[PDB]
Symmetry: C2
Subunit: 151 residues, 2 copies
């Protein structure tokens, strides 16, 4: 559990531009690429915005439908991907609502109960061999779906 002190938008913008200007294709030779437990990545991301959500009077639900799911990736870029989805979810979330975060065997879903920064999500995902699906949820609200090939 390493600590890094800062906001997110400014860190995101810089990293996005550095990724674009490097014209990087694969993760193979990136510093610190490892097998990331997505369970811990998602939980760690929830912990980071927990207090922010509390003061915005928003709850964060973490549903773990699968366990032991591991993907090859750069933990910092992946954390940045998740953090942008959570920040977006919290931002457009009315008091008393729940931001829904679900870990499935081949995807994770970030869902809010509301009515760019999402372009880096797509860029980091593609880099990680992940697809990103945006759209409206069944029970209403905005829904981001990051998916990969099931192991």
């Amino acid at each position: 559990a390493l600590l890094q002190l800062h906001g997110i938008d400014r860190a995101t913008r810089l990293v996005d531009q550095l990724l674009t200007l490097s014209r990087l294709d694969s993760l193979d030779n990136l510093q610190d690429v490892a097998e990331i437990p997505l369970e811990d990545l998602l939980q760690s991301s929830v912990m980071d915005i927990y207090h922010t959500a509390q003061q915005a009077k928003i709850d964060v639900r973490l549903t773990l439908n699968a366990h032991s799911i591991k993907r090859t990736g750069q933990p910092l870029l992946l954390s940045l991907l998740v953090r942008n989805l959570l920040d977006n979810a919290v931002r457009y979330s009315p008091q008393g609502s729940v931001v829904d975060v679900t870990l499935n065997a081949d995807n994770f879903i970030v869902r809010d109960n509301g009515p760019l920064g999402l372009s880096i999500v797509q860029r980091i995902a593609k880099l990680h061999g992940m697809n990103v699906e945006f759209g409206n949820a069944e029970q209403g609200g905005f829904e981001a779906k990051v998916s990969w090939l099931e192991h």
Copy 2:
């Protein structure tokens, strides 16, 4: 131990900076970035705030490890054109390095002058992102031994 890194707002707070450094250093090199001309969020940076803020990130943790951090400000209203996150990384690397090779009970000196700042420890007499970020900002970095013993890093610029 864990590959994961907490993003907010002794070894654990050096590790965070270490991981961000490694990634951004690599990305800087691969992008072969020449100037600040097209970088996002390039602005006039007040160096007092940057140094004080960096000291603030470190102070309490270093205190618990019996290391005192002294910030001296000889000049004020000093502004440089730069990218804030990169300058924050530069300063923090020099700081983490100075706290790391500092023996217990010693003092780390951070000094801001008109055309330079100095980070100085009392330790013995890897981090070349400092050189890279500095060069990008039109700054020079000089390493060496302190006038009274210990390590010294000086970041200088013109005007």
